[PDB]
Design an enzyme around this catalytic site. Structure first.
Site, PDB file in Angstrom:
ATOM      1  CG  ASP A 133      11.205  44.522  39.003  1.00 62.07           C
ATOM      2  OD1 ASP A 133      10.530  43.538  38.613  1.00 62.07           O
ATOM      3  OD2 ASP A 133      11.226  45.608  38.399  1.00 62.07           O
ATOM      4  NE  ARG A 137      10.372  43.323  34.366  1.00 62.20           N
ATOM      5  CZ  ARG A 137       9.376  43.822  35.094  1.00 62.20           C
ATOM      6  NH1 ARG A 137       8.137  43.373  34.933  1.00 62.20           N
ATOM      7  NH2 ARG A 137       9.614  44.761  35.995  1.00 62.20           N
ATOM      8  CG  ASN A 138      13.247  41.026  36.919  1.00 59.96           C
ATOM      9  OD1 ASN A 138      13.846  41.354  35.891  1.00 59.96           O
ATOM     10  ND2 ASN A 138      12.474  41.871  37.558  1.00 59.96           N
ATOM     11  CG  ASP A 151      16.586  42.881  37.304  1.00 64.85           C
ATOM     12  OD1 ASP A 151      17.156  43.483  36.353  1.00 64.85           O
ATOM     13  OD2 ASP A 151      15.764  43.437  38.070  1.00 64.85           O
TER      14      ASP A 151
END
Ligand SMILES: Brc1cncc(-c2nn[nH]n2)c1
Ligand SMILES: Brc1cncc(-c2nn[nH]n2)c1
Lengths: 258, 251
Positions: A133, A137-138, A151
Site C-alpha cells: 500500500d 495517505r500512508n 502504515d
C-alpha cells in the site's frame, strides 16, 4: 525490550484516527531524553484477543526495519488498554500537507519527497519485503525536508486506483506492483495531494488501464520525471524498473531540474 | 536488427563445444576486423531446433554490460550462426583448474565481484538466469570475466528449485553462493561423491558446503547468507556487490 512502562507515557491530544482506534500525540520520559515526542496508536476493542493479535501484528512487522525514512517503533504496552508507541511526525499526513502548501512548495521539495520515499522502498526491497500500500495517505511529514513511510498493518485490506493491473485482476503483490504504486504516489506528490482518477468508478479503472490509458502529465512536471512514472506503469511487471534504479534516476532529476 | 551477411564472417579454429554445435573463433570485417566467437548449430535444418538456438540471441540483444558477453549478430540462412564477442582464455572452471598455483586470492575475489555486477544488472532488468555456475563464465583477460550461456544442476540449485521448480531472484543468489565457493575451490565441483537425490536431504538437514582453505571468514560469512533455507532471508545482488567490493579492497 519492546514492552514500555505506561507511567513513562503522558497522553496528549488526538492527532488522527486509525483502523483500531484513535491516534494521539504524547511524551515518553525515558532515562536518556527528558521528554521525547511520540505518537500513541490506541485500540478500542482490544479486550478481544483476536483484535489484539491483529493490532499487535503491525508492531511485529515494524521492529524488523530500521531506516531514516520509515516510522520507528519505540515500544508497546500489551496490558489493557493496549498501546503502540511510535516516533511522532509532527506535520502529519502528506496528502493534507501538500494541499495546504500548494502555493508555497517548490518543485525541488516535491522531487526530494519522492527521492526520500524511493530510499525507504529500496531498503524494503533489500529486505525482500512487499509493502502492498504505497500512497500519499500512508506517508507522514516529520519536517519541511523529511518524510517517512508509515502504515504497516494494511488499513484498506480497496485502493483500486493505486494498484497494478495484476493486483486488481489476480491479487498478485510483488516488488513490481510496489513500483507501480510508487509511480501513482509520485503523481499525487506533483498533483499537490489530488487523488488519482477522480469521478471514475473503481470497476471502470481496470478497463482503462488494459486499454493503455494512464494518468496525465501534471502541469508542474519535468517531462523526464513523467518519463520515469510511465516506466513504473508498464503493463508487464517484468518490464518495470527496480527501486535501486528509481533512487538513482531521482538523484539526477533532483540536480538537473532545479 | 542483427542480421549479418556471411561474406563478412571468416571462420577459424574450434575453441569449444556448445549445446547445439561447435563454437569457433573468427573474424568479422565491418566499416575494422574484429575477433569473434561463432556458435554453430549442427541440426538446424529443423525449424524447432533453429527456434530454440536463435532464442539465445533474442535474450542477449536486451543486455549491455561490461561483464556480460555481447551479441554482435546472427546469420539465419543455413548453416545458422550466432556471432558473439570473443573471450580468448575460455571457460572459467578450466582456467581456475589450470592456474591452481598461479592465481592470488585478490584475483579470485575480483572474479566474484565482477560476476556480482553482471548479476545485479540482470536483477535490475528483472531477469532470472536460472543457471549460475563457474562453467557458464568466460575469461576475457587475467582481470576480466564475462557471463555467458543465455539459453540438471541439482548441486547448484536452491531447495525450492529442486522441490518445486521455483526460479526467482532469491534462487539466483543461492546459485551465486555456490559459484563463489567453486571460484575459491579452484574449479572443484560442489558435493563430490554425493548422489543428486541425496543432496536435497542434506540441505534440508542444515548441511552446507565447507569453508574453502585460506578463504576470508568474512567472505564465507557472505556465502552462508546466500544459503539461507528461506528465500526471503537471502540478500539481493546490490548488497552482495557492495560487500564483495569492501572484501576486495581489504585484500
Ligand atoms: Br504513526 C504517526 C506518527 N506521527 C504522526 C502521525 C499522524 N498525525 N496525523 N495523522 N497521523 C502518525
Ligand atoms: Br560465446 C564465447 C566467447 N568466447 C569464448 C567462448 C569459448 N571458448 N571456449 N569455449 N567457449 C565462447
Amino acid at each position: 525490550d519492546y514492552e514500555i512502562q505506561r507511567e513513562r507515557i503522558e497522553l496528549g491530544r488526538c492527532i488522527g484516527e486509525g483502523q483500531f482506534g484513535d491516534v494521539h500525540q504524547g511524551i515518553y520520559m525515558s532515562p536518556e531524553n527528558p521528554a521525547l515526542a511520540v505518537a500513541i496508536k490506541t485500540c478500542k476493542n482490544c479486550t478481544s484477543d483476536s483484535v489484539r493479535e491483529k493490532f499487535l501484528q503491525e508492531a511485529l512487522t515494524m521492529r524488523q526495519f530500521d531506516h531514516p525514512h520509515i516510522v520507528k517503533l519505540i515500544g508497546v504496552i500489551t496490558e489493557n488498554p493496549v498501546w503502540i508507541i511510535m516516533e511522532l511526525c509532527t506535520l502529519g499526513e502528506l496528502r493534507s500537507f501538500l494541499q495546504v502548501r500548494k502555493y508555497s512548495l517548490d518543485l525541488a521539495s516535491l522531487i526530494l519527497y519522492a527521492y526520500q520515499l524511493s530510499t525507504a522502498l529500496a531498503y524494503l526491497e533489500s529486505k525482500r519485503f512487499v509493502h502492498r500500500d504505497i500512497a500519499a495517505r500512508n506517508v507522514l511529514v516529520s519536517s519541511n525536508d523529511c518524510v517517512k513511510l508509515g502504515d504497516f498493518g494494511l488499513s484498506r485490506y480497496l485502493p483500486i486506483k493505486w494498484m497494478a493491473p495484476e493486483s486488481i485482476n489476480f491479487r498478485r503483490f510483488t516488488s513490481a506492483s510496489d513500483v507501480w504504486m510508487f509511480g501513482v504516489c509520485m503523481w499525487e506528490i506533483l498533483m499537490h495531494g489530488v487523488k488519482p482518477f477522480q469521478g471514475v468508478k473503481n470497476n471502470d479503472v481496470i478497463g482503462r488501464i488494459e486499454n493503455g490509458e494512464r494518468l496525465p502529465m501534471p502541469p508542474n512536471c519535468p517531462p523526464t520525471l513523467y518519463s520515469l512514472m510511465t516506466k513504473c506503469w508498464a503493463y508487464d511487471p517484468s518490464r518495470r524498473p527496480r527501486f535501486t534504479e528509481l533512487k538513482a534516476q531521482l538523484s539526477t532529476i533532483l540536480e538537473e531540474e532545479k
